[PDB]
Structure formats: C-alpha cells, structure tokens
Amino acid sequence: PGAEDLEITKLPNGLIIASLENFSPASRIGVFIKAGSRYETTANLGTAHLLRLASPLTTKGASSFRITRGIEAVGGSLSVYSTREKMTYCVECLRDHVDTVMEYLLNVTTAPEFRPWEVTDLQPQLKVDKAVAFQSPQVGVLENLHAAAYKTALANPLYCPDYRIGKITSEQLHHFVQNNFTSARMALVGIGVKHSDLKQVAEQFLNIRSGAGTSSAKATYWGGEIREQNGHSLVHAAVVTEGAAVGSAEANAFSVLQHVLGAGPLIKRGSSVTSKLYQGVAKATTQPFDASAFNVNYSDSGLFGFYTISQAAHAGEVIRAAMNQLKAAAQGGVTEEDVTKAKNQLKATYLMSVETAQGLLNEIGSEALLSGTHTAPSVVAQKIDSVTSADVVNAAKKFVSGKKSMAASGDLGSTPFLDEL
Amino acid sequence: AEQFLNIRSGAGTSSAKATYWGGEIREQNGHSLVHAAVVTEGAAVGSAEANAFSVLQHVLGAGPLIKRGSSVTSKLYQGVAKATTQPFDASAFNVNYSDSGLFGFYTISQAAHAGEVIRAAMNQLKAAAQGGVTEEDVTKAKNQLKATYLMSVETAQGLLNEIGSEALLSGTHTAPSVVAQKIDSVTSADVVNAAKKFVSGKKSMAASGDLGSTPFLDEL
Amino acid sequence: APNIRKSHPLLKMINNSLIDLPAPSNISAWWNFGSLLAVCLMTQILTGLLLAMH
Amino acid sequence: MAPNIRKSHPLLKMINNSLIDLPAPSNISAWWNFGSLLAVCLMTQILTGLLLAMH
Amino acid sequence: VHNDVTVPDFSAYRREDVMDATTSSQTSSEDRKGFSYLVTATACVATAY
Amino acid sequence: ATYAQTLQNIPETNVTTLDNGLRVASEESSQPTCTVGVWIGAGSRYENEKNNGAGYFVEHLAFKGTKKRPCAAFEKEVESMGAHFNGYTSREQTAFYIKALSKDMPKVVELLADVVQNCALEESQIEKERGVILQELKEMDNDMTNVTFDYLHATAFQGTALARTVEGTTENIKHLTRADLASYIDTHFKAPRMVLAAAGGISHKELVDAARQHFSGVSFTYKEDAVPILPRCRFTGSEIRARDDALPVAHVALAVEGPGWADPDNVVLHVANAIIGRYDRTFGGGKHLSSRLAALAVEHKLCHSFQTFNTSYSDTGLFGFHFVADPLSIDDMMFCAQGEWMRLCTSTTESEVKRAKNHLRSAMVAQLDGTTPVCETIGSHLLNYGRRISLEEWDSRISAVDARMVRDVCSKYIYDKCPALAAVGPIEQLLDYNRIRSGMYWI
Amino acid sequence: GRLMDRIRKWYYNAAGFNKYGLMRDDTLYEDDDVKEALKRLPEDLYNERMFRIKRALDLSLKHRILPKEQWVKYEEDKPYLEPYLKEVIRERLEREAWNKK
C-alpha cells in the first residue's frame, strides 16, 4: 500500500500536525519549532545552545535517568538539531514502540524542570560541545559571517559565547521555553505513523498555550568584515550579500545561480566542469583549493555569495578570481543551457534530499511549520524550472551591486580586504 | 658607544607603509561597562598638523586635572555629562606615529547609556568643526599643553625619553622654547580644521563590553 | 619541596600522622585513649623485654 | 573512586604499588634476585625459629 | 607513512603449528595452550605436594 | 501496520544472471530518484607485494575518463544530468556507483559499464594521480583511528595478504605502471566477480536489459568464469606499539579472530557488540547510558570515545573494540573494557540481550535509509552471501538470540584467546601483552 | 489527637541540638544520600548550614552552649534539606528498581 496520503491537520490553537505513512518498519516523529539563537538578546546569549544540550535533563513526567534508559530500552534515539531560527526535537524507533518513545519526546519539549543543579552540572559541556564543533574551520567563519552580515538577531552565534558558559540560569531556560515553545510556533510532524494517531496525541497532550510569545527583532543588515588571523596553512573566506528570504520567487533565482556557479562536487576527486566558479578559480591558481556558491535563506532575510578555501599565499588570486566569475555572470555571461543544467542539478538535489528519513521528515516539517501546507514535488519543480535566464543574471547583479560582508580565517597575510574586491 | 657597539650599520629591513583601513571591531564580552574609541587618520610625527590636533585634543578634553573633580575646560566631557546621568568618562584620543597617526575620542560608560554617551561625544566634534571653538579656548588649551609637556620632563624617565625620542628621529634637540614657540603659534583656524578633518575623514571604531546598545560606526 | 618535613620519605610519614595531620577541633578526652593505648603497647614491650631477659 | 579495587583499597593499593604494577627495568639480571631471596630467608628463619623457640 | 610499516618476520620463534601463513592458527590453539597450561598445572601439583 | 507486517510487505529483491556470469539485482520502490552501481569482489587482499595499491590507483582513474569519452566529456555528461558519481576500494570489496533520476537508469548503466570496461588509463593522468595519491597518504597518516586499524590488520594478519593497507605502499605508488593498472583491471573486474545493483523506482526487467546490452564481453575458457578462492590469512595474537608522546591522545584497538561472513554466529556477535555499545563525549545520555562500559567511561572519565566492531571477511574477521583516551587513563579504560568482554562470556542477562536486540534491529533498518545504502546492502549481500537477506530474515535470526547463546558464542570467540593489539600515541601507561592476555579470562 | 506534637516537641527539646543553634537537618549523618542532597542546596542555604555547624563545633570544643535566648524553637526549626533528600532517595530507588527489571 505505497499509495498513502500526506495528511496535515491544524488544531484551533495553531498547532500544525503533519503525518505520512510509508509503511517503513521505522517511525520518526519530531517537534519542529520556531526558536533559536535568533530570539536571544545580549542578556541571554547562548541560552538556546544550552537548551539544545539540556534535552536529557529531568522533566515533570520523566526523570533524567528514565528518559535515557527508557528510549535505549527500545533501541530508540533522541536528538535535537537547530539553526539560528528553528529547533527540531526528533525520535526514531521501530514501529511498535512509537507509544513508548513518544512519552519522552512530549515531556522533553513541554514539561522541562530545568533543575538548578542539573543545569549547573551540564554547563561545562558547552565548552566541550563547542570545542569539537570548532574543529571544522567552516563553522568558525560562518559564525563570524553572520556577525558581520547582521547587527542583530541572525548575528547571534549558534554556539554559546565563552564569557557566558556557566552563567546561563534556569530562569533563563524556563523563560526561553515559555516565550518561544508556544503551540502556534510548533509543528508535530511524523513518519511511519497514521495521521489519526499522531493527530490524537497532539490535541491530547501538547499543552503550553498558544501565541507567538516574544517576537524577534527585525534582521538589520550591516555588511561588516571580520578577520581571524590564526596562522593556519589554509585560508577560509566567505563573501556575501543580502539575498532572498524564505518563500520568494527571488529565492529560486539564487538557488539556480548557485548551481550555475558551482554548488558542491558531483564526482569523487573529479573536477567540476559545470561549475563556472570552480573552473574560473582553477584557471587562476595551480595549488589545491575549493570554491563554492554560498546560499542561505532565512525567514526575513538571506545571504548569497561564495565560500573559498585556499593556500595562504594564493588566497589573494583565488578570491579575486571568484569575484570575476560573479561579475562576468552579472554581465549576461550565462548561457541558456547553463540555466537548463543547473535546473536539473537543482531538481535532482532536492529529490535526493528526501531519500533518507531524516531528510524527508525535515522537508515535511519545515514547510508544515512555515505555512501549515505541503507543496507537491511537481509544483516545486514547476516553480524552479520556470526561472528565466534573465532572473539569474539579475540575481548575479544584485550581488555585484549590493553591500557585501566578508569573513576570513587563517594566515590572512595575502587575503584581500573587502574594499579591494 | 664607539669602542663597544659592533652590530653594524645599515637601515636594516625597512617597514611597510601604514595603509589606513577604517574598520570596525566589536568584542561582545558582557562587561557592565562599555569601552569605545572612534578615530580618524590624524597627524604624523613632525607633521605640522600635529600641534593642531594636540591643541584640539586639550580643547576637547585630555584627561582630568582635579582629583574627583569635573572637567569644565573640557568640551567633550561637559558635553557627554549633559547627556547622561550615570558614571562615565570621555577623552580626546591622539597618537602620532612616524608615517601616520590617529585622532578621535575614547569613552567608557555603562552599557545601557553607551549609545547616548558616544553620540554626545560626536556632536562635540561636529560642533567644534563648525567654528564652535572660542579664541580663549585655544589659549587655555595652549597652556595645559605647554604645562603638560613641561611636567612630562620632571622625572628622569620622562626626561631621558624626551631627549632620546627626538635624538632618534632627527639627531637633534629642540629648545623647550622653540617647542613652546611652535605650539602657541597655532591659530584657532588650524584647530577648527583639524576638527573638520575628523568629521569628514573615514573613521575606524573599536568597542568591548555588553555592546547591546553601542551604536555602529555607520550610525554616527 | 621547600621543606624536608614534607619531602623526605620518612619524615613525610611522621608529618602526615603526627604534625600536619588534620584533626577535629572538638574531640574530647574520650579521644585520648587511642594514644594511651599506643603508649601502653610500647611500655609493655619495653618492660616485657626487660623481664624476658631474666 | 577507582574502577578497580587493586588500586583504590588502602591495603591492596600498597601490594599493587610494590609487587604488581611496580615499574621495573626490563633488563635486570639474576643478580637482582637476591633481594627477594633475602626477604624469603628472613621469613623462613622467623618461621623455623619460632618453631624451635617453642621447645 | 604508516602504510610503509610491516610486522617483521617471527619465523625463528614461531611454534611449529603456526609457522605457515596460509593455515588457520585456531586449529592448533587449544593444543598450544593446553600444553603450556599443562606445565603450569603440573607445577601447581608438585608445589601443592 | 505492525513491525512484522511492514517487514513482510517490503518489495522483494530481484536477481538474474547474464550468460557472461554477471549478476543483476535490484529492489524496486516508487522513488523518482535512484542509485545503481557495480560491486566488484576485488581489493588489496587480491593484490600482492608488487601491485599493492593498484586497486586504489585504479579507483583514482575510474572517473578520469574512458575510451569512448575522454575526461572533460565524461565529466560534463555526468554532471549535466545531476547525477553523483562515487566509489570506494577496501580489502575484499570495491564499488562504483551513481545516484540519479530513475528516468536515466539506462544511460547510467551504460556509463557504469564503460567505466569498468574501458578505462582510459591516460598515461599522463596516471603520473598526475601518482602525486595526488601521495598527498592523500600523508593526509590519512594523521588519522590516528585509521592508522590504528591499519596497524591492527598489519599485526593480526601479519605475513598474510590482509596485512596490507588498501592505499598501498609508497614504493608501489611511486612505481606502479600503466601496464600494472591495466593488468589489475583485466584480472579482477570480471563479470562473474561483479554485481549490478540498483534501488529506487526502476524496472528490474529494464535494468537487466540495459545490462545485457552493455555488460557483454563473455568469456571462452573456464579460467575466465571461475571465481578464485583466496588463500587463508593466518591470525596472530600479538601487538604493535607505535609510541609518540607528542600526540595529545592515545588510540588503542584490541581484537580476536572473527568467523567470516557466512557464519550465523555473526548475528550473535552483533548482538553482543550491541550490549557493550559505543560512546563519545557528546552523548547527552551521560552517566545514565545503558552500556555499562559507557557509564563507567563517564563516571571515571576513562576516554574521549570507544566503539565495538565485528569486521567480517570471506573466511576470517576481526571482533574487538577501539578507544581514544588521555595518556593517564589508558590502563583503567583497558581494564574496564576487557572487564565487559569477560562479563559477556560469563554473566550476560536476558534484559541485556533484549535491549541489545532492539538496538540491533533499528541498526539494520537504519542501514537501508536511502537508495545508496540499500543498493550497498544488495551489492554486498550477493557478493558475500550470494543472495539478498531480507530484514525479515535478519529479524527472524535476531529474535532467536538469548543470553545463553550470547555467552556461549562470546565464550567461543573471546574467552582465553590471544588478541591482536595496536596502540598509537602516548601509550606508556598501557600495560604489557602478558598483562593484557590475562585480562582474557575469569571475569 | 495531637499526641505527636506533644511527644515530638518534648523529644526535640530533650535532644538538645538546638542548644548549639543547630537545626534538625544540621545533625543528620552524612551518608551517601545526604551527601548528594547537600550538593543540591542553594548557595545561601549551604553557607548558612556551614556557619551553624562550624559554630557548634566551636561551642563543643569550648564546652559551652548558646544563651537560652538563641536556642532554636521547635516550631522555628527549618527542614531545609528534607525536601531534597526525599527526591534523592526516590531517584535512587527508581534506579535500583529499574536495574533489577
């Protein structure tokens, strides 16, 4: 019976419920939420990070001990992914245990006790968590990027700043959950389950009243430049401009310009010929490198540009070469066939993204959260290819003309400043 | 010297020219107090335009002269004072290097009032750029400047440093009279010009503390 | 180590059990019998040997 | 405190630090055997000595 | 690099039954151990005696 | 819709064999996207002292173009259709696979066949990759975990073929000839030793057809259609210690010889490993984790991480564990680790296996999360078991496992065995072989 | 009938730990459960307990007690630790129970 429906109710309090039965032996339920470091202010920075790690602490219904033992008892799992503006709490497990695993998912997101001692004990973990994440230079410059790109909200780091480790309080965690984990900002998405079932759980257990709680400040663009000189042999650099926000015909344009420029490798150890940006940078330097079209879409804003990685001595030429590929593209240097191919890679990528349970559940929930609906994989494809070569060249122009923000780390001895691009 | 100093001659490796950037660095560290400094390319060592800034410095406010006392002869302090009620501190910043210099103001204030305190410091600079500088102000400043320089050389460390610094950047020694002669011979025009070069030139800023209310360089 | 009372392998021991040893400030006379017992032991042994020799 | 008694226990700790986990040079010859033989003579002399002393 | 590292040859020391690289060593394991443990058990017997 | 039911309703895996000896298998679903690839029974184990690292060298050219279409052409064509081209080479298995729109399943099959049959082996490209491979060997040399596992094989299977690393020696990489690679390909990439697997929304009959069309070149003699049985690799209880107190943490791996693919006991060993589990400093669970070893690790801060493993092969395997720890906590970690291994053979509980069985089920289900992973299962299964094994069969087998069975099987492979040890980094605190060997009994 | 109150108030005064200025909870023997509970006390409640104890030990060594006006009153004795201690023991029993299950 692989011809099931993708139902999606929406209770009165505003809580959206999207489910889908693919008869997979494994179910994967999740609680999507419009929360994140975006809603933090100077006073409570990092509270969202800690809240992420606080998932295993004791709740009003389950103890720290039972949360962990319980889920493990049935080969289940519990994790929490989060972006600057959204948090997802999901659990996976064999079909016959969805009941068991559910109790916990529930308690965690709606009935936390944030006991003072348990919180105090957990805070040193922020150093550790942050330490392993920062082993990828990628993560470090993206933090600085957002801090140069904005003055507020999205400018906040995704990992708790150092001066605040150990300073976050239980009050702060409670207040955060109270003012953000509201029924009208949450969505209960599920896979390998039956809508009637999932729907029932929601209306019966999910409480914590509706509202939009504290609303987040508007994202103000800054166009700054942060340079972390740390001596590494490799230099990571990212240059962006304010791009389209989530839900926009402008978005699609950039998505395509992205794939037209070069959005990641397709062949192992292979060169990317279909990549304007890569191929361009390649012609400029002889040493190992990496260039890509960077693209982020947020609720009320976005960022677009290119991310490079190069040897220190050749950082200069590698970054300037990436720039020319953008100007050149803004000046009609975009074939009509290029736009065709990119549209394939874009349609393919999106389509592959949903092969894995994590990817599917995330697709459903994200949309079912930002508009309690579900676009058909055909309408999305329909919307994408219906993007003229004009659109793309325009996107490219918005970049060359807009104010830019840059972030670079490594031995910046030869890395150019934003005003020399 | 001659009988013992052997590491020999040359100008050794020369240093690269100082290129101005005009960037902005913000260290958000949560401290109750916010330190912030806004500057502009100022004058170089020996640059005639030096004294002009030195004087504009003392005209704006270059450090306290009375213990726990207010600085009335301080345009900048007095101006900031009128703006905020809480504890603070504002001063004219000024540095002169071989091939460049920096000029502006340095503030320290509670986090919540960092905004108004910094903006108030700016107005005192515009206002000064727009002839808002008495001819008496320039007279007083020239006193504080002549006095300061003269006191600087009271301690052995200060004297030796005075001699050496000049004896290094020009193997000579200006008489304490020629220096005074050069200083007071600075018109009120000069000063107002210096003040202008600041309001018009590209600025660079650096601030640390709980910058939640600290304005960005492009909001000044 | 700056002072022998703590570094020396033998003194270290005398120091950690009879000089720098942390003791409750409020132990009464009922806590005296431990050392008295120790002295009885040393005393009994000493006089015992003297007797054994005859 | 310690996962294994051989290291935590105040008495075993001692036997362990002098007869089990004690670090020893890999190349000591038979001339390094007499120390323990001496210790065994001592215990042996004492044992037989008490037995003789009893008569 | 570590790839350029190989365990030396212990033929001058290997017990007869594990000398050949193309033969499972598990088939002679119980004999190899049984023997060694036999010596030990015997020493315990003599000692107990 | 119960777990049982979902397992029974999973589309069956279809297999058919061409006259040349090649096997074509595929599991059908309703996905617009799919993955298809050719899993070859080849690897470093099949190489020898002179051509070691050839299979790897080949893996580097298998994507730089064929005869029908040079580099640029080959690349552009694959890229321009939004398909992903990946692959890998291990000790006993190799694979080249593509991800794309089911709508191209046929063009892809043609592409695959062209790769495995007509690799250009551009004389100039070879010298170019010679230098690339040499850079990857220096990169991988800093991967302690992989340096450690290589060493584990180097000593555990010393003197044999499984002792060599997949990437090969520096000397070999510096001297492999265009002819050697050519020879490699011809000797090993042969129909009977390969498997065309695909998963997603694809027609088994349409797959098998494109297969007949491109995978042809049948064999004449008998020596061309026989799958050569490899000579046995002797396991050796021993240790290799690479000390460098300059390294921040130490890696340690201990292991005993395992049974080999075809043995049913592997279902039990995997349940066993499920009881001990694994851990790393970012497991929120912390001190409440079910895995005893993990709990102790947390309480006494025994390590940064640890993991169990049951690496199978045709006729042998490696069952053991691996941990990373500070120089001063190696001894306690090894102690607790070997302790848990003894508990297994001696005191496993029904509750313990119950949990471990569940954990293992969702583990097998997770290895079929996408087209590529499912396609990987097929390639491997036919190549190792000569047939696909359904989740329902596994589950059937997993369900039969009980405490007693765990103790008996573990006692069989672990108790009083001479292990293989590999230690790298600041390992002064790790006690000698003899002491470790004693940790192999009583518990 | 209020017989306990009669008895419990008698014992409280008979015990006499209140003559040192100690709360009932200050006198508990620090076994495993108590030790854990103490770790959960809020800073101030912890520092207050410490002073009372250090002070009592001082009284004990001096062989004095507090002036009758400072003795804690049966109805003003704060059971500051009992709540925590109870949670601790509950949790422990839960783990214990679950580890047999």
Ligand code: HEM
């Ligand atoms: C724990 C320590 C000791 C205790 C409790 C102890 C107790 C006694 C007692 C109850 C007597 C009998 C006294 C009597 O004549 O009424 C005695 C006799 C004796 N003890 Fe000890 N003794 C101790 C240690 C020693 C030692 C260490 C030696 C000698 C190395 C020793 C040697 C003697 C001798 C020679 C006598 C017999 C002569 C006599 O009775 O006066 N004693 N001891």
Ligand code: HEM
């Ligand atoms: C370092 C340990 C000892 C040494 C070097 C030692 C040595 C000797 C020697 C040289 C003799 C004379 C043997 C002979 O008759 O020719 C002797 C006699 C004796 N020893 Fe020891 N002895 C030791 C410990 C002891 C101890 C601990 C005791 C009893 C508690 C003891 C009790 C005796 C007795 C009773 C005799 C007299 C009977 C006899 O001579 O056979 N000895 N010892």
